[PDB]
Ligand SMILES: Nc1ncnc2c1ncn2[C@@H]1O[C@H](COP(=O)(O)OP(=O)(O)OP(=O)(O)OP(=O)(O)OP(=O)(O)O)[C@@H](O)[C@H]1O
Ligand SMILES: Nc1ncnc2c1ncn2[C@@H]1O[C@H](COP(=O)(O)OP(=O)(O)OP(=O)(O)O)[C@@H](O)[C@H]1O
Ligand SMILES: [Mg+2]
């Protein structure tokens with residue numbers, strides 16, 4: 001019943017000209033997709049990027065999530081979440097953990113992979129575009145509790161936990177190649193992405209149209225603004241509030257006929273929206289960095 005959490009990827013370069021990485025491990029004599037266990041304090045996306053680099057030598061940018069694999073192990077259940085990951089270069093060197101890495105077209109990779117579950121992941125990988133741009137919709141971190149004035153507090157800050165969530169989000173949002181930063185017009189929203197701002201040395205663009213009060217007054221202008229931001233060059237992070245996100249995500253998924261595999265709305269959570277030629281092709285809900 002204990003779950004051992006892991007993450008991994010279909011690491012690719014160049015759908016039918018695309019080549020994917022398949023690795024061999026001497027300890028098991030297996031051919032599989034790179035993956036490994038989450039270290040203490042890591043989220044799945046962070047672990048996937050790190051394990052890909054450790055096992056293949058390549059850096060990469062994560063995109064669409066590709067489902068979950070589980071299997072029994074002595075400790076309980078191994079759980080592995082997989083991402084499409086576009087290679088950003090590197091070099092493989094054989095060692096005792098991983099002695100071979102082959103780059104194969106998807107069909108030949110399917111024959112090389114020995115585990116039925118890995119082939120299922122690869123089938124998902126080719127079902128939709130993989131050369132995707134990414135919009136990251138983040139619910140601000142924990143910020144104590146609303147007071148008893150009507151509606152909303154503009155200046156209420158993140159609390160101690162929430163500041164730590166903000167710090168923990170840097171690596172998770174970097175895993176997806178975030179480049180540009182946007183926050184609703186509330187201090188707690190800005191503070192959630194300020195650590196990332198400092199890392200990227202980027203300014204955060206303030207978004208009055210995306211606060212809870214603005215969404216309730218004019219939802220159409222919020223939707224229009226989301227699309228506007230998404231159309232800009234780069235991979236934007238947009239930090240907003242709990243009454244806003246579910247509505248925005250549902251509306252986009254509905255109109256694009258995209259089915260999210262997970263749903264939630266927790267403070268510090270992230271929706272990874274994958275676009276191909278401006279169309280939504282994936283909506284992946286990630287838990288807060290300090291939650292399961
Ligand atoms: N998709 C699948 N379905 C069913 N069984 C699968 C399987 N994949 C591997 N195994 C089988 O489970 C056992 C443990 O291997 P593993 O889960 O890959 O365990 P691991 O802990 O050795 O490897 P990772 O989770 O990849 O761990 P790290 O990279 O974090 O490990 P390291 O830190 O030792 O490099 C092996 O016999 C393997 O054939
Ligand atoms: N005084 C209030 N007026 C209206 N809604 C409230 C009030 N207090 C709580 N809520 C509701 O509870 C949710 C969470 O409130 P909480 O005080 O925990 O966090 P919050 O930091 O204001 O969250 P968010 O900015 O995402 O709305 C809010 O999103 C809102 O839907
Ligand atoms: Mg491994």
Ligand SMILES: [Mg+2]
Pocket residue numbers: 035036037051054055
């Ligand atoms: Mg490993």
Ligand SMILES: [Mg+2]
Pocket residue numbers: 036037
């Ligand atoms: Mg490891």
